[PDB]
Amino acid sequence: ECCHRQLLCCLRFV
């Protein structure tokens, strides 16, 4: 997934 804490997309387990 993306982590919209950043511009980066990292696997953020929602």
| Residue 7 in tokens | 């511009």
Measured distance CA(13)–CA(7) in Å, rounded: 16
How was this one solved? NMR
- Using CA atoms, how far residue 2 sits from 11, 12, in Å, is 6, 6
| Residue 1 in tokens | 């997934």
Triad 4, 14, 7: Cα angle to 5°: 15
Q: What does the DSSP 8-state code read for residue 14?
A: -
